[PDB]
Amino acid sequence: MVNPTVFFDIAVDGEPLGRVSFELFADKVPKTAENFRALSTGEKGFGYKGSCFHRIIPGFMCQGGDFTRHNGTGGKSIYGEKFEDENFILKHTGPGILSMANAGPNTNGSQFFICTAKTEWLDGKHVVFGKVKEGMNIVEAMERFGSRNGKTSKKITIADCGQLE
Ligand SMILES: NC(=O)C1CCCCC1
Secondary structure (H helix, E strand, C coil): CCCCEEEEEEEECCEEEEEEEEEECCCCCHHHHHHHHHHHHCCCCCCCCCCECCEEECCCEEEECCCCCCCCCCCCECCECCECCCCCCCCCCCCCEEEECCCCCCCECCCEEEECCCCHHHCCCCCEEEEECCCHHHHHHHHCCCCCCCCCCCCEEEEEEEEEC
16 A cells, blocks of 8 residues: 555664654565565564664765674675665665665665765665655764764664554
8 A cells, every 4th residue: 555654763872862764665666665664663583673873974875774793794684685676766866865785786685875965876776765754854963973984973773663654
């Protein structure tokens, strides 16, 4: 029926900041949207709750989802360690776009990023699968703890997450 909505409750050094919610585009990328949905509810017995945004670059993006190595080298999908690029129907049009991190063709896992600018050079290379719905102000707040090389000045965590609606 209706595209799912998920939330993240963000904290900064363990202090609550606020909530970001996302629309996931199951109508266009059902397999990639499902992966992110189920990681967010934790229903397969693993997922995003307690993980961090390990790399944040102001004027670029906030990246997270590495719940096995905590640093951009780990993570796994609900389909296996890696899965294929589903399609590239949606493009990186500006701030708020949710897209899959990868290390080569057909290597999607659990890592994702939230754009904070237009990143058109990733079109056709990273699968876009959602967008921030509410709390873009919380994303901009998070983004101020990043740096040019992406190291964060305070620890940015998903204190809680799950499905709304
Ligand atoms: N190689 C990657 O997955 C990165 C692409 C640029 C945005 C952060 C994820």
